[PDB]
């Protein structure tokens, strides 16, 4: 509690840079100091521009090329693969045809630079959990036609919840004593790293930020052209909420400003209202387009005061607090800030096993680096896929599917218990496989499983 005792402890932490100490103290200050639901307003086409209403690029190529000379592409790469049972950066999990997320990213940018003769740089924002591994991995791209920059974001101390002291101040100085404080940190870190000023000197004007695991976040020149023509200093890509997205962060008007609103800022009495997709119709994809000169101005001015997100964790039986911020929450600080409501093709996340099943099946293919949806697929929606904990770890997932089944005509798959799948299986309509406790169920090679429940070996 209070300020200067915490500040003294933090200044004691010789692992932290001066900019890190100051940044962390600033978060703690605002968190300890402190959205009225009734003052919230639903957005309109004046805040959220439909992607269709935007003016397409003209057939004139030199225009496309002038747009691309101003662009820097940034991928958020601070997350480990441990949620999916893998060591190393999440971005080095193989997504399809043997290629990692990062492989696809390098290939896309290389092909942009080929198609158009531009020199679009890639930058990866790493964390202390991914920085060294990433540094070694990216050597593989040495001869690739893309300049790849990396920088490490901030490293803040986990705070012991009960005592409110930095955990490293109590001797917990190994990796478990610290955390990367969210992707909101991308802004000060891009500044603190020196990279922002670099890109500035070269006449770059915009950065396109996206999660390294969103397969849909490809350079879109309609969006960028709009920002230049309308002087929008920030643009969030949003997409309509389906029932799968009810908890997603959304864009509102609040005290005269476009703002991101997340469930955390929403009172208990109001969460059900928040979750209504007729009320709040769109959600943040984390595909963000931001003006570089505006970042520099706002970071230098100490203007970016995003909502603090507690994120408490229990680590080795010690409850800690991890104060973090979100990159989309910065939207309220930028001049002429907007959302662009985009097709869901631009939001294809891999967060679990079930998403790999999506993108590794015949429902998609690699075309020139792009995870391209099968044209045969009649329904504009992807099948719903649910798997038990048996399928959580990627390697176990891959072993439980002798080959990935065809899902091109699938509507829905649910799998529970100890289930194994043979090769060349085809899945259609609504499929359920449910192995009871103590039972292992194996689905034979070349099975066609169609609008059917499988609750035992007695379902052939």
Swiss-Prot record:
Residues that hold UTP according to the record: 76-79, 90, 153, 182, 213, 351
Cellular localisation: Cytoplasm
Chief location of this protein within or outside the cell: cytoplasm
Entry's Gene Ontology BP terms: callose deposition in cell wall; cellular response to phosphate starvation; pollen development; sucrose metabolic process; UDP-alpha-D-glucose metabolic process
GO cellular component: cytosol; plasma membrane; pollen tube
Induction of synthesis: By sucrose.
Keywords: Acetylation, Cytoplasm, Nucleotidyltransferase, Transferase
Positions of substrate binding: 78-79, 183, 211-213
GO molecular function: UTP:glucose-1-phosphate uridylyltransferase activity
Entry-linked CDD domains: UGPase_euk
InterPro entries named in the record: Nucleotide-diphossugar_trans, UDPGP_fam, UDPGP_trans
EC number(s) from the headed UniProt entry: 2.7.7.9
Catalytic activity: alpha-D-glucose 1-phosphate + UTP + H(+) = UDP-alpha-D-glucose + diphosphate
Lineage: superkingdom: Eukaryota
SUPFAM superfamilies per UniProt: Nucleotide-diphospho-sugar transferases (SSF53448)
EC class of the enzyme, as a word: transferase
Record-stated family: Belongs to the UDPGP type 1 family.
Function: Converts glucose 1-phosphate to UDP-glucose, which is the major glycosyl donor for polysaccharides. Acts redundantly with UGP1 and is essential for the synthesis of sucrose, starch and cell wall, and callose deposition.
Name assigned to this protein: UTP--glucose-1-phosphate uridylyltransferase 2
